Every structure is written in C-alpha cells, then in structure tokens.
Ligand binder design. Structure first.
Ligand SMILES: [K+]
Ligand SMILES: [K+]
Ligand SMILES: [K+]
Lengths: 91, 91
RNA sequence: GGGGGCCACAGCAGAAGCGUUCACGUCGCGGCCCCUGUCAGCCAUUGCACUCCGGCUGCGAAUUCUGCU
RNA sequence: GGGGGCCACAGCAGAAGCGUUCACGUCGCGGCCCCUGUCAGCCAUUGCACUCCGGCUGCGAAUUCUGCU
C-alpha cells in the first residue's frame, strides 16, 4: 500500500528538530521532490519523521533504497504512512 | 593517610570542564578553602578530579562526608591523593 | 536569560578594573532565597502524525578608588 | 567562528528583515571547494594527575529588494 508519505522511526531522539529535518532532507532529496518533512520531539512523536514526496514513485524508491540505512548510528525503519498526509489528500 | 588533596573518580564524563569545576567547588568549599581543582577531559584523566584543600582536616571531612554522594546521577568515589600535589609540596 | 521576595547600603556624578561581547560603546558588577524561557545530566518512551506540551536534577557571571552635597 | 584556494562584484542613499548580542547601536549578512576552534551523535575508556592531544561521523551565523546616477 504505497503512499506519498514515508514513515520513518527508530530515529536518534537526541538530534534536535532543525538539524534532523535538514539531515533527512539531505539524504532523501535524491529520490525526488520533497513537499514537507514533519518532525516533533514530543513524547508520542519523538524518534519519528514523516517525509512527504511529491510523487509516490519517489517514496517507493526511498523506502526500498534507505531501509535500514544507518542515520546518526541508528538504522532507519521505513514504512509507508498509513493514511494520506493532509496536504496530499487536499491535492 | 590524610592528604591535602582528594582524588574523585566515577564522575560523569559528559560534564564539561568549566561546569564540572564550578559544581565540584560548590559542594566541597563547604568543608574549607580550596586551593585548586584540577580537571582534564583527556582519555587518561576524564571522569576524575583533584580537589586541593588548604588544610588536611578539610580534605578528611570532605572525604568522609561526600563518599558515595550522587553527583550528576553517579556516586562520587573519593580517596586521598597518592602523592602531594605540586603546589602543596612546594609549600 | 526573565520576573518577584528578604537582608544590607546617605544621595548624585565620575575614573579605572572587571562581567557579558567577534570586538567597541551603552548596559551590568553587596549577601541569601523563590519562581520561570533556554541549555545540560539522568530516567522513561519504538511511538502513524499533520503538531506548544513526559518526569526529576543542576547551571543561574563581574569591585576598587575619587569628587560634590 | 577562524585560516586558505577558485571564480563572480558601479558609486551614493535608504526601508523591512536577519545574523552576532542579556538586550540595543557600531559592524557583518554573493557562490563553490579545502583545512580547522567550538558544538553534536556514536564507539572506546573506572583512569593518580598537575595538564594541547583517544577513534569515527555530522552541522559549518546572516537578505529579497528599493529608488537616483
Ligand atoms: K530510541
Ligand atoms: K522526531
Ligand atoms: K571528565
């Protein structure tokens, strides 16, 4: 069940928000245009990120190519987001 | 063998040199005048400190009173210094 | 960093030395507390969101002198 | 933050913002590459000194303009 948005967890929770978004953008921008990267460090949402790609093909390539990739010395676990991100559902 | 200088190890190695010196001074100056606090973060000397008291009785009181005291969530391990500090030997 | 409370202290002006600062100028530099943005340490969390928001603890910078009343 | 290399850049005058800053004013805010203070993540280290000094990885302060010539 592919999706425009990939769900990444098992992220290093010590990395700050602005730095985590910039590093996630640096390693995921080669798969295609990124519309947004959503990161929160609250108890519920820490260690996780949502990367919204402009095209589902980019998300599929990113999920297959970056699965288990070490990122701040922790392997990224990548799934498709279970539901459409708000911006995707509105366009 | 009460020495002017107490040797403290099992110290939190993530604490930076200036903060470690100020915090060690806050709890040990209660026991008497401190002549110097020697802290190095090199591989050999990290997690350790030398607190030099002006009088030997202060070092004995500081040792008996602060043995095992939680310090940055690690129990302080205090001994007398095996040899005199350079500044004490020259006095 | 911010906001209050005690206990000092005759006022105003000035010089220098410091503190903060890439540096310079303004500014600030008596003791003890309390509250609070950030930051750090430890604990807890493997969590599917479109969002301020887990807990505890700690850091909370810097004095001499000279005029006038 | 600093030190270098390679290109790009006409002067005067302003407005807003940003960066550095306890906060203002001065100052600074084009691109790429290399080295590096610091900082951060991971790994290793329980160590008796009077001192630069373990390894690897990452970030690398800040502007679009605006008129006149
Ligand atoms: K974790
Ligand atoms: K996160
Ligand atoms: K140390």
């Amino acid at each position: 069940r592919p999706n425009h948005t990939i769900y990444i967890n098992n992220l290093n929770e010590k990395i700050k928000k602005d730095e985590l978004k910039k590093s996630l953008h640096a390693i995921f921008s080669r798969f295609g245009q990124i519309l947004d990267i959503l990161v929160s460090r609250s108890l519920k949402m820490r260690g996780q990120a949502f990367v919204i790609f402009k095209e589902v093909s980019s998300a599929t390539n990113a999920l297959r190519s970056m699965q288990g990739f070490p990122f701040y010395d922790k392997p990224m676990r990548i799934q498709y987001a279970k539901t459409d991100s708000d911006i995707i559902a509105k366009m």
